Design a protein around this ligand. Structure first.
Ligand SMILES: Cc1cn([C@H]2C[C@H](O)[C@@H](COP(=O)(O)O)O2)c(=O)[nH]c1=O
Ligand SMILES: Cc1cn([C@H]2C[C@H](O)[C@@H](COP(=O)(O)O)O2)c(=O)[nH]c1=O
Lengths: 190, 190
């Protein structure tokens, strides 16, 4: 067993996650490393195109409905992701189950709790590290992201997404690099 | 609290569930009762039309993906269903979470268990009675339906779907009628 690391980037919209994920992937390749970039929702599947329609406000879904649909989109990619990590390929993943929970809880729907919202993604891979880009609807998403982060300060590392692009990139590298060495370990699951 | 009963019909395809559900609804109305008929998957929503495309083999979904999507389609209707029962309206429901489990387990996918498959539908209403129409892919769906039925012989009543239409209708009435009187009770959940 020689496995890659599983790195998740989380945060509110506009936090520069998309760019910082491409940069981390570039640093890992500059270290001769094998790495793939995954982004959720995965819009390339049939369900992902439905989700894209949802995000464009062309189709509607209730809170619990939408929660399970975004989770199904993640569950769909677990065989591919497990194969890649086991081959030794690192995964950098932009948004994951935590976005799923935070965006679902921020809707304030009746009869949803955090305990309920954790059921949908059970069995999915657990990341070796979650990088949270810390920078209204987005305001309550951040509140949930803070509660998740403080629930598990082992997994969650918080970067200052207000600093410069190159500066954030540097701080992310400094957190992630020790993990790349240390994991080559059993897979962890939610 | 004066609530209606929640009756689920389950079984393999071709078991006459669709007709027997319309007949039960007719008997309840003939008893002056308020009743609505619900069928899953609910093809009238945006997600339900996606599911219809799935069943027509026009879109694809992996086992775990499909499981959560069919479950989201059920979760979507829970506010409506709870409102109806609380108003005293009986619900006769053709297919439910149990079909969801059975059809999902019959695919024989890797890394699915019955324990996993029960997570998606948690929080949904639990029926007061499940009528199982007892009459290859459909062969393993029946095997799962038998295991579910024998797990909980309080809830599950098994009818002989080989007898005549009018005869099955009679046997279903004889099981359901005592429940209609007795529930008018707290709601039960999965
Ligand atoms: C992964 C995920 C994303 N989202 C949202 C966050 C974004 O507003 C949107 C698309 O994200 P994106 O901009 O990163 O593509 O989908 C959810 O609502 N639930 C989820 O589970
Ligand atoms: C409710 C439900 C139905 N199904 C299947 C059973 C049928 O083959 C099909 C449509 O059922 P229908 O003929 O009762 O409309 O969908 C699932 O695969 N999963 C589910 O959760």
């Amino acid at each position: 067993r020689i496995r890659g690391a599983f790195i998740v980037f989380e945060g509110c919209d506009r936090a520069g996650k998309s760019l910082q994920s491409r940069k981390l992937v570039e640093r890992i390749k500059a270290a001769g490393g094998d790495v793939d970039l995954i982004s959720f929702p995965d819009r390339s599947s049939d369900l992902g195109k439905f989700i894209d329609r949802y995000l464009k406000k062309e189709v509607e879904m209730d809170p619990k409905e939408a929660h399970l649909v975004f989770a199904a989109n993640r569950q769909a990619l677990m065989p591919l992701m497990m194969k890649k990590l086991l081959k030794g390929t690192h995964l950098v993943v932009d948004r994951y189950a935590y976005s799923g929970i935070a965006y679902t809880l921020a809707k304030g729907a009746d009869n949803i709790t955090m305990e309920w919202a954790k059921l949908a993604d059970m069995g999915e891979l657990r990341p070796d590290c979650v990088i949270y880009f810390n920078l209204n609807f987005q305001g309550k998403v951040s509140k949930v992201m803070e509660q998740l982060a403080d629930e598990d300060r082992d997994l969650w590392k918080v970067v200052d997404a207000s600093l410069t692009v190159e500066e954030i990139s540097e701080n992310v590298w400094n957190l992630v690099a020790p993990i790349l060495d240390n994991v080559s370990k059993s897979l962890m699951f939610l």
